[PDB]
Amino acid sequence: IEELLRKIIEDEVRHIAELEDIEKWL
Amino acid sequence: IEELLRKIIEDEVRHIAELEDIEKWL
Amino acid sequence: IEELLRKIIEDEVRHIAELEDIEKWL
Amino acid sequence: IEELLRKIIEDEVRHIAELEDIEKWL
Numbered sequence A, B, C, D: 001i002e003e004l005l006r007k008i009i010e011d012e013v014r015h016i017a018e019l020e021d022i023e024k025w026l
């Protein structure tokens, strides 16, 4: 479970970058 | 942007499965 | 923790709707 | 769309805190 949560956190972190980039580009 | 949003959606979908699994196991 | 995971899942579910809507509108 | 993306980012940010807290507690 701990390693799985780590993977989910890493995804959420990538989403912050990706969504902030979309915000900038729009 | 559309392909990027698709990738983010796919991640969020995986998170639903993963978090629901953690809920079941806990 | 179980109730907190439930709240996170609910958010992720809302994101799928919101991101799919953005996909449609773009 | 820009305001909606902002709301999603805010949720993802809360998830990082919440998931990191779960990691610490587990």
Ligand SMILES: [Zn+2]
Pocket: A012, A015, B012, B015, C012, C015, D012, D015
């Ligand atoms: Zn998310």
